[PDB]
Amino acid sequence: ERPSDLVVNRLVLFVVKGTATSTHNTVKPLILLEELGVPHDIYVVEKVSAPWFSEINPHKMVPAILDRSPDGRDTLRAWESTSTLMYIADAYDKDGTFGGRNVQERSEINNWLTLHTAALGPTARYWLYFYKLHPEKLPKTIEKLRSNITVQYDILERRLNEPGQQYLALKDRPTIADIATLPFAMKSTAELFGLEFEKWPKLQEWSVRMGEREAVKRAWQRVAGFGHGEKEYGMLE
């Protein structure tokens, strides 16, 4: 049931129409693609409920990836934003600049990547659901989720207060752990949650340091635009 314009000649990143609250997961793989200069296409999904899309991601959410296998004879897929970061690092980051160069680096990268994937990420996702999408309003649930966000900010703040710890996983450079965390740990997102981001100064300084990277600027610029160009849905450009 695949749309006619869906072809996989290179990495295809699946996104939706760009809004303030539709881009915080899709921007993650886009940042890493921009950091590594990976050739890729953008596919704007009209309906994530469409049967053809569930064959790619059974969880029926963006981001998702279709790409050629290393030998180029088969197609493979990545879904869940953390999984898209793990795939891009595996396939395209051969020097381990963002994925980690050894067991030691990867131990810490996986600690802070998994902490985001298991705690802040899902908590932020449930907060957004109950705050906007759920038919009924449940303030007690929304407040508890907001409370849990501040606990995760406290953990990140502690880490970034350790001597010479410029980034979450490694002291020297940002990794897929930092890319996964940034969209749910920046001033704009903090303000959406109704939090004063200045209460976590080292986390705020970290979010600014990440935001000054050219690949991060390019990612935020592009993700906002998807679906608002001459072509509303389907394969862009």
Place this chain on the structure above:
Amino acid sequence: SERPSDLVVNRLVLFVVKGTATSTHNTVKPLILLEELGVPHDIYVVEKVSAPWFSEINPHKMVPAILDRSPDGRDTLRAWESTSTLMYIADAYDKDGTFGGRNVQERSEINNWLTLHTAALGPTARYWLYFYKLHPEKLPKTIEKLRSNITVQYDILERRLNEPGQQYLALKDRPTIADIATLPFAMKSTAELFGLEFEKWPKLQEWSVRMGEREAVKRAWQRVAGFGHGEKEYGMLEA
């Protein structure tokens, strides 16, 4: 913070708590992989996860956690979050990628199904359990929505295991860290806790039995239940 005198890192040390019906569903995950690969390891039964010395290992103040020697033996490494403990054991000890994946194609699907548990199943189960038992007030509308999300997640796993020759979640041929991560939240006992009839997902049930029949899985479940009930209640157990 000073570590307890009996905490030394001569090999992989897995941090657990005293074995109970409600304390083992995460700690069993790394233990299953350690048993599958025959990795040499010690067991440390943590009395108080609130202890400052333990927060220096895992800032999230939960088990499982790991301390281990670096490959070269110069440094001490750490792994925390159960999914991260599986990643670390696979990286350090699974040289043939028997559970970690042998190529980019295998690892793509392993990381999909692993992360589905880490990001969706695990947090949904944790929030259900929190609102059902731990939260001072009962919020049945929240609990019912989380229970609903569990059935959708069971539907996804069932769909995958209905695909021709798909015997395991990630790979057709063998179980991986994806299967190990998922098993405790997709088995009959857990389904009954959620108030669900597990027979509604027959291929998922068949998969849970297939995983449960593995010798390493049997050994893991026995050992996690026993920790802290031997000759030593807390601290480094004597293998």
